[PDB]
Amino acid sequence: WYAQDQSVALSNKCFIKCADLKALDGQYIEASDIYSKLIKSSMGNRLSQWSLKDYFLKKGLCQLAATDAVAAARTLQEGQSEDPNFADSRESNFLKSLIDAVNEGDSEQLSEHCKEFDNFMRLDKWKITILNKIKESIQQQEDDLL
């Protein structure tokens, strides 16, 4: 209804919390889709730059919790090519390293990257839950591996 009212900021905030709740509740694909909506609505605005910097990462994380490694890869590539600030941002580097670790299936490397990401930027419960789900997907993969 905020989009219907042409209020960009209200719709953007409501979409942020909406995608947050959707991703934390197991529904990764729709949450990533809402993050794509957030990216498109917030693209080109200098005030919401920082928000975008976060959005690309969040979308990649959600798509990676959905076992779609190629999806996080395209999300990262979109973030790097579309948003110059996110290209040089530690969020982009964290997302590539997450993608690389899950590509290798090396849960140890993933644990390390969580630690360095915490070291300079304390991690939020949303990202911890998603990254724990990705690790536990490596463990479910391990269960499959026998």
């Binding site: 959905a66 076992t67 779609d68 190629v70 999806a71 395209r74 499959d144 591996l145 026998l146």
Partner: protein, 195 residues
């Protein structure tokens, strides 16, 4: 028997493989309506697969295991154009495998010497009568150990060459059906650990 069958292009959306059995079969899991069973289909005029019926896959979608998706460079829920592939009409005479070379790759690694013959036996047993091209990733389970098998190179020969005169080709273009008489060579995996 391909003397009488349709070759029309069908638009199928790649999806997750239903279970490990279909992945272990090296088959594209398709709905009964989409394509018959145990028949060769080429997607993008590049990647050949053998269909297998699956009731969990609705019409309009094609199912793949992870390795085949990484090989195809496809994302989940991405359209691909699939047609019925006739090797005999395509290659003409280079329709059999004279020598096929595969990387075998494994934290659970093992250093012991691996005798190629058992891998050849079980690989052929699992994937007999299938069209193969180089650079194909697959998953195969051996003695409780899961391996990723990456075809290096395919040498394609006709049924009848006493002396193999066809050069060992690496391109995806060359294709041949796996048979017991194929000269199967194995070397170190994608991992480089298998000895």
């Amino acid at each position: 028997d391909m003397t009488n069958m349709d070759t029309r292009t069908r638009h199928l959306k790649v999806s997750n493989c239903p279970n490990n059995s279909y992945a272990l079969a090296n088959v594209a899991a398709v709905s009964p309506n989409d394509f018959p069973n145990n028949i060769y289909i080429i997607i993008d005029n590049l990647f050949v697969f053998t269909t297998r019926h699956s009731n969990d896959i609705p019409p309009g979608t094609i199912g793949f295991n992870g390795n085949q998706r990484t090989w195809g460079g496809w994302s989940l829920n991405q359209d691909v154009q699939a047609k019925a592939f006739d090797l005999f009409k395509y290659s003409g005479k280079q329709s059999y495998l004279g020598s096929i070379d595969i990387d075998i790759s494994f934290g659970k690694a093992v250093s012991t010497v691996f005798d190629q013959d058992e891998l050849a036996k079980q690989f052929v047993r699992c994937y007999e009568s299938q069209i193969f091209s180089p650079t194909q990733y697959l998953i195969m389970e051996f003695q409780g150990h899961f391996f990723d098998l990456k075809i290096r190179n395919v040498q394609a020969i006709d049924l009848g060459d006493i002396e193999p005169t066809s050069a060992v080709a690496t391109g995806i273009e060359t294709k041949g059906i796996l048979t017991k008489q194929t000269q199967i060579n194995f070397f170190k995996g994608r991992d480089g650990l298998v000895n």
